[PDB]
Write an enzyme that holds these catalytic residues in place. Structure first.
Site, PDB file in Angstrom:
ATOM      1  N   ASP B  25       0.766  -1.225   0.000  1.00  0.00           N
ATOM      2  CA  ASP B  25       0.000   0.000   0.000  1.00  0.00           C
ATOM      3  C   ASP B  25       0.811   1.297   0.000  1.00  0.00           C
ATOM      4  OD1 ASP B  25      -1.781   2.023   0.530  1.00  0.00           O
ATOM      5  OD2 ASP B  25      -2.855   0.961   2.084  1.00  0.00           O
ATOM      6  N   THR B  26       0.868   1.956  -1.164  1.00  0.00           N
ATOM      7  CA  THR B  26       1.604   3.228  -1.313  1.00  0.00           C
ATOM      8  C   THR B  26       1.007   4.414  -0.557  1.00  0.00           C
ATOM      9  OG1 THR B  26       0.533   3.746  -3.446  1.00  0.00           O
ATOM     10  CG2 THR B  26       2.592   2.555  -3.547  1.00  0.00           C
ATOM     11  N   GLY B  27      -0.245   4.304  -0.148  1.00  0.00           N
ATOM     12  CA  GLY B  27      -0.870   5.387   0.581  1.00  0.00           C
ATOM     13  C   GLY B  27      -0.777   5.238   2.081  1.00  0.00           C
TER      14      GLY B  27
HETATM   15  C1  LIG Z   1       5.182   7.595  10.470  1.00  0.00           C
HETATM   16  C2  LIG Z   1       4.374   7.885  11.724  1.00  0.00           C
HETATM   17  C3  LIG Z   1       2.892   7.820  11.419  1.00  0.00           C
HETATM   18  C4  LIG Z   1       1.993   8.158  12.610  1.00  0.00           C
HETATM   19  C5  LIG Z   1       0.505   8.128  12.244  1.00  0.00           C
HETATM   20  N1  LIG Z   1       0.357   8.208  10.780  1.00  0.00           N
HETATM   21  C6  LIG Z   1      -0.757   7.837  10.157  1.00  0.00           C
HETATM   22  O1  LIG Z   1      -1.757   7.438  10.760  1.00  0.00           O
HETATM   23  C7  LIG Z   1      -0.761   7.940   8.626  1.00  0.00           C
HETATM   24  C8  LIG Z   1      -1.099   9.337   8.201  1.00  0.00           C
HETATM   25  N2  LIG Z   1      -1.788   7.022   8.164  1.00  0.00           N
HETATM   26  C9  LIG Z   1      -1.709   6.318   7.043  1.00  0.00           C
HETATM   27  O2  LIG Z   1      -0.754   6.387   6.259  1.00  0.00           O
HETATM   28  C10 LIG Z   1      -2.903   5.393   6.770  1.00  0.00           C
HETATM   29  C11 LIG Z   1      -2.562   3.923   7.075  1.00  0.00           C
HETATM   30  C12 LIG Z   1      -2.006   3.634   8.485  1.00  0.00           C
HETATM   31  C13 LIG Z   1      -0.543   4.010   8.655  1.00  0.00           C
HETATM   32  O3  LIG Z   1       0.199   3.958   7.657  1.00  0.00           O
HETATM   33  O4  LIG Z   1      -0.147   4.387   9.780  1.00  0.00           O
HETATM   34  N3  LIG Z   1      -3.349   5.518   5.384  1.00  0.00           N
HETATM   35  C14 LIG Z   1      -4.616   5.342   5.035  1.00  0.00           C
HETATM   36  O5  LIG Z   1      -5.504   5.033   5.840  1.00  0.00           O
HETATM   37  C15 LIG Z   1      -4.941   5.523   3.543  1.00  0.00           C
HETATM   38  C16 LIG Z   1      -5.670   6.864   3.349  1.00  0.00           C
HETATM   39  C17 LIG Z   1      -4.942   8.041   3.950  1.00  0.00           C
HETATM   40  C18 LIG Z   1      -3.604   8.279   3.648  1.00  0.00           C
HETATM   41  C19 LIG Z   1      -2.893   9.322   4.245  1.00  0.00           C
HETATM   42  C20 LIG Z   1      -3.521  10.142   5.153  1.00  0.00           C
HETATM   43  C21 LIG Z   1      -4.872   9.922   5.467  1.00  0.00           C
HETATM   44  C22 LIG Z   1      -5.572   8.870   4.862  1.00  0.00           C
HETATM   45  N4  LIG Z   1      -5.816   4.401   3.251  1.00  0.00           N
HETATM   46  C23 LIG Z   1      -5.351   3.159   3.271  1.00  0.00           C
HETATM   47  C24 LIG Z   1      -6.398   2.063   3.047  1.00  0.00           C
HETATM   48  C25 LIG Z   1      -5.833   0.636   3.065  1.00  0.00           C
HETATM   49  C26 LIG Z   1      -7.005  -0.320   3.361  1.00  0.00           C
HETATM   50  C27 LIG Z   1      -6.765  -1.689   2.819  1.00  0.00           C
HETATM   51  C28 LIG Z   1      -7.337  -0.362   4.831  1.00  0.00           C
HETATM   52  N5  LIG Z   1      -7.313   2.222   1.931  1.00  0.00           N
HETATM   53  C29 LIG Z   1      -8.541   2.672   2.154  1.00  0.00           C
HETATM   54  O6  LIG Z   1      -8.931   2.994   3.280  1.00  0.00           O
HETATM   55  C30 LIG Z   1      -9.454   2.782   0.931  1.00  0.00           C
HETATM   56  N6  LIG Z   1     -10.671   2.016   1.141  1.00  0.00           N
HETATM   57  C31 LIG Z   1     -10.998   1.055   0.293  1.00  0.00           C
HETATM   58  O7  LIG Z   1     -10.336   0.809  -0.715  1.00  0.00           O
HETATM   59  C32 LIG Z   1     -12.286   0.284   0.579  1.00  0.00           C
HETATM   60  N7  LIG Z   1     -13.003   0.053  -0.702  1.00  0.00           N
HETATM   61  C33 LIG Z   1     -11.955  -1.060   1.226  1.00  0.00           C
HETATM   62  C34 LIG Z   1     -11.396  -0.935   2.627  1.00  0.00           C
HETATM   63  C35 LIG Z   1     -11.028  -2.286   3.165  1.00  0.00           C
HETATM   64  N8  LIG Z   1     -10.075  -2.940   2.276  1.00  0.00           N
HETATM   65  C36 LIG Z   1      -9.986  -4.252   2.117  1.00  0.00           C
HETATM   66  N9  LIG Z   1     -10.799  -5.065   2.791  1.00  0.00           N
HETATM   67  N10 LIG Z   1      -9.068  -4.741   1.295  1.00  0.00           N
HETATM   68  C37 LIG Z   1      -9.735   4.298   0.541  1.00  0.00           C
HETATM   69  C38 LIG Z   1     -10.805   4.405  -0.565  1.00  0.00           C
HETATM   70  C39 LIG Z   1     -10.138   5.101   1.728  1.00  0.00           C
HETATM   71  C40 LIG Z   1      -0.248   9.243  12.989  1.00  0.00           C
HETATM   72  N11 LIG Z   1      -0.523   9.031  14.283  1.00  0.00           N
HETATM   73  O8  LIG Z   1       0.358  10.321  13.208  1.00  0.00           O
END
Ligand SMILES: CCCC[C@H](NC(=O)[C@H](C)NC(=O)[C@H](CCC(=O)O)NC(=O)[C@H](Cc1ccccc1)NC[C@H](CC(C)C)NC(=O)[C@@H](NC(=O)[C@@H](N)CCCNC(N)=[NH2+])C(C)C)C(N)=O
EC number: 3.4.23.16
Lengths: 99, 99
Positions: B25-27
């Site tokens: 997951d690139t996002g």
């Molecule tokens: C490096 C320190 C990080 C600290 C921490 N950071 C974060 O929380 C960062 C911003 N979050 C992220 O990067 C999170 C993932 C968790 C993580 O990596 O930690 N990313 C995400 O949640 C990104 C969206 C996003 C990106 C950036 C900012 C905001 C939102 N979505 C990732 C996610 C993966 C999915 C399989 C669960 N995709 C989705 O949620 C998509 N949804 C879908 O595609 C749905 N159709 C299906 C969901 C279920 N999937 C499945 N069963 N296969 C989209 C359409 C919303 C915070 N506390 O400060």
């Protein structure tokens, strides 16, 4: 181009006459765009990810320009924390994951 | 290998000696795994996604094989709807988005 992952992969998109920045997300099935008055018909929808579900309006047949590449498909509009280009559009611009 | 996106980019990973399936997951900034026992000290953390925040356990310096490529780094374990390999590990195996 080739986008490395040291930083979030952000590109410029053009949707409905407005130029924006969106995250290329291989883990998103759908494309989610921040709240905007897009003309046209739409259907109420709910999508989820980490944390839960949010309510969105689904617009079909939308035309969007991803980094100079044209694609047409469904876009979900709602209070997303970030503009996200999902796989539905990514496949149309021939994107791949390589390693 | 070169992975197209017509289907979810799912790969087999191995962590703690147990095989699992996960989404490249690139996002995602981080790597999140569904609740499991993992040997080691962990710390309480909170991460967010499309639907909100969730509490996770942070495991530092964990060894993991992703599609047969070795990575060693942070892994977060919590109530995620899907196992996800984020950028922190994607960079370790040399993955880039191409189009
Ligand atoms: C490096 C320190 C990080 C600290 C921490 N950071 C974060 O929380 C960062 C911003 N979050 C992220 O990067 C999170 C993932 C968790 C993580 O990596 O930690 N990313 C995400 O949640 C990104 C969206 C996003 C990106 C950036 C900012 C905001 C939102 N979505 C990732 C996610 C993966 C999915 C399989 C669960 N995709 C989705 O949620 C998509 N949804 C879908 O595609 C749905 N159709 C299906 C969901 C279920 N999937 C499945 N069963 N296969 C989209 C359409 C919303 C915070 N506390 O400060």
């Amino acid at each position: 181009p080739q986008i490395t992952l040291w930083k979030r992969p952000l590109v410029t998109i053009k949707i409905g006459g407005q130029l924006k920045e969106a995250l290329l997300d291989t883990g998103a099935d759908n494309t989610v765009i921040e709240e905007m008055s897009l003309p046209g018909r739409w259907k109420p929808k709910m999508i989820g990810g980490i944390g839960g579900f949010i309510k969105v309006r689904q617009y079909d047949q939308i035309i969007i320009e991803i980094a100079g590449h044209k694609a047409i498909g469904t876009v979900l509009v709602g209070p997303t924390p970030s503009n996200i280009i999902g796989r539905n559009l990514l496949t149309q611009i021939g994107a791949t994951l390589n390693f």
